[PDB]
């Protein structure tokens, strides 16, 4: 039953992930500095879909070659429960975090089956002065963009953005370690490994979560409560799932446009953490599950053994 990876104990559990609506947008600016500013203000306040509006993250920085604009850009993902709630959140965030940022321009990030109106709705801030243009892109496909007049110039925004089907969120694996300062470093180099997978992001601050989201609760209609089992202050008593050597636990949550990306992002995090884990006191690695019946996708750590 016990599993050992790179000399560090790994529990024989699975990560319970859920099906989610996901979409991607490419935001470009004249400089990469302001491309990042625009994305950073858009991704903020988006660590969970249940409390925050959505789950947002920056997938990758784009060079002037990887972009339809020809200007340095940013590929930024957004996830939500329902395709309507996702549309509602994208409209709010693009409208007041992208449109407001100077010199920006919004394009559709990923290809998908369902359509989401973006430029066609922000066009109404133009007060009837906005115009629409249709142009074939570098691949040969006819795309429609809106031109909203603003103080700095024109905010060009593609009419529609596509939402990919089968985007998976909630894939997580948590680390148990002796000391906060050192074990944070283990998780830090763990998120750096996971970020690299295309189409996958980590919404929480720096990718790391310190509050253990537990389903249910002790009193009345608790929807979420802290995970008393993995709390170091509640050690020694029955119901604490961590050994006496452990003193700090940190969780890593991954969302991705494709299910395979969730598994590959977890695998890379699982390996990178254990390789350096012994040096910084990493005791063990487990995954968060809810019982098996809540979430469709199960990411067993036993399948993540193969090196990347």
């Amino acid at each position: 039953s016990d599993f050992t990876l790179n000399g560090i104990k790994v529990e024989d559990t699975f990560a319970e992930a859920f099906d989610v609506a996901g979409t991607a947008i490419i935001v470009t600016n004249d400089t990469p500095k302001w491309a990042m500013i625009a994305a950073t203000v858009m991704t903020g306040f988006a660590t969970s879909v249940i409390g925050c509006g959505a789950e947002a993250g920056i997938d990758a920085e784009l060079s002037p070659d990887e972009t339809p604009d020809g200007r340095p850009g940013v590929r930024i993902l957004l996830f939500g429960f329902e395709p309507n709630g996702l549309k509602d959140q994208l409209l709010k965030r693009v409208g007041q975090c992208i449109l407001t940022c100077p010199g920006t321009a919004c394009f559709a990030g990923v290809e998908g089956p369902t359509k989401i109106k973006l430029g066609g709705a922000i066009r109404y801030f133009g007060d009837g002065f906005a115009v629409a243009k249709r142009l074939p892109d570098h691949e040969g496909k006819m795309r429609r963009y809106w031109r909203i007049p603003v103080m700095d110039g024109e905010f060009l925004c593609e009419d529609s953005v596509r939402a990919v089907d089968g985007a998976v969120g909630g894939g997580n694996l948590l680390f148990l370690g002796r000391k906060h300062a050192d074990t944070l470093i283990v998780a830090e180099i763990a998120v750096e490994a996971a970020k690299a997978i295309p189409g996958a992001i980590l919404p929480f601050p720096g990718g790391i979560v310190r509050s253990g989201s537990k389903v249910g609760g002790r009193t009345k209609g608790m929807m979420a409560s802290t995970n008393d089992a993995y709390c170091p202050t509640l050690k020694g008593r029955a119901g604490s799932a961590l050994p006496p050597e452990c003193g700090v636990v940190l969780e890593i949550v991954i969302d991705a446009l494709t299910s395979a990306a969730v598994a590959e992002s977890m695998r890379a995090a699982l390996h990178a953490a254990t390789e350096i884990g012994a040096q910084h006191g990493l005791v063990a690695v487990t995954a968060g599950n809810y019982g098996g019946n809540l979430g469709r996708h199960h990411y067993h750590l036993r399948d993540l053994l193969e090196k990347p």
Binding site: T28, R71, A105, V131, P136, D137, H138, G153, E154, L156
Partner: protein
């Protein structure tokens, strides 16, 4: 499928529904009897051309006259190549495909064309890309390429699509509903009279309308997109977008949502 023009046309000729899709179904003997003449005396396809047919979506008319009206009109399939000059209404209402003309074209070339590409290696006639009498719109989504020089009222009441002209005559982009016209060289007097929406870009320009005001020299993202679109199609006017441009807002007589770009200096 090749149609070898026997000789000079005695009357104007209507080549509608003489598309490679329609020709394939017909027999070579049966296709010859199709009348294309305007007059009561009329003319059949056999009287005008030497018909060689094969089950293909490609059609080549060897030899052309300025009396070949509605050539390639309503074309939904395949391609038509005219090695010669053509008459009015090149690809009227063309749905999709490609239509190439070696010589020059008559007036109203490209009317109501929805999709596909009409290429005139020669010069375009008056109202090229323009709307015909009582027409709701001129060019309606199809790409129109005139390597030569277009006449007066290029893109007249144009609704959609793109026009790539070498040179343009007077009153270009008049009554324009929407679209994109990039003429690489000279542009006639009074462009864009009554323009509602659209983008007009030219190298040289004549006298401008009093209802056009200059916006300045703005670096716009749309210009970058239009430039990459022209680069990808192999357009000679793609270099016109490389430098900084001078902007003018669409005719203020109507809702002034159109625009005009001309090189800074």
């Amino acid at each position: 499928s090749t149609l070898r023009l026997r000789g000079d046309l005695p009357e104007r000729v209507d080549l509608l529904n003489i598309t490679p899709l329609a020709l394939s179904g017909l027999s070579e003997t049966e296709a010859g009897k199709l009348a294309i003449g305007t007059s009561r005396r009329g003319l059949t396809l056999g009287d005008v051309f030497e018909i060689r047919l094969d089950g293909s979506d490609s059609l080549v008319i060897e030899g052309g006259s300025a009396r070949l009206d509605r050539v390639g009109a309503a074309l939904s399939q395949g391609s038509i190549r005219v090695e010669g000059d053509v008459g009015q209404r090149l690809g009227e209402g063309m749905a999709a495909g490609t239509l190439t003309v070696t010589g020059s074209a008559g007036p109203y070339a490209g009317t109501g064309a929805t999709g596909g590409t009409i290429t005139i290696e020669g010069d375009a006639g008056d109202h090229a890309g323009g709307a015909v009498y009582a027409a709701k719109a001129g060019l309606d989504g199809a790409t129109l390429v005139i390597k030569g020089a277009a006449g007066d009222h290029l893109g007249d009441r144009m609704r959609r699509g793109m026009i790539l002209a070498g040179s343009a005559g007077a009153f270009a982009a008049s009554r324009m509903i929407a679209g994109t016209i990039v003429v690489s060289g000279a542009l006639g007097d009074h462009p864009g009279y009554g323009m509602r929406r659209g983008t007009l870009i030219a190298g040289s320009h004549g006298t401008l309308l009093p209802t056009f005001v200059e916006t300045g020299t703005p670096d716009l993202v749309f210009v970058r997109l239009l430039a990459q679109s022209l680069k990808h199609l192999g357009a000679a006017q793609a270099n016109l977008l490389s430098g900084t441009l001078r902007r003018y807002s669409g005719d203020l007589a109507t809702l002034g949502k159109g625009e005009l770009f001309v090189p800074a200096h």
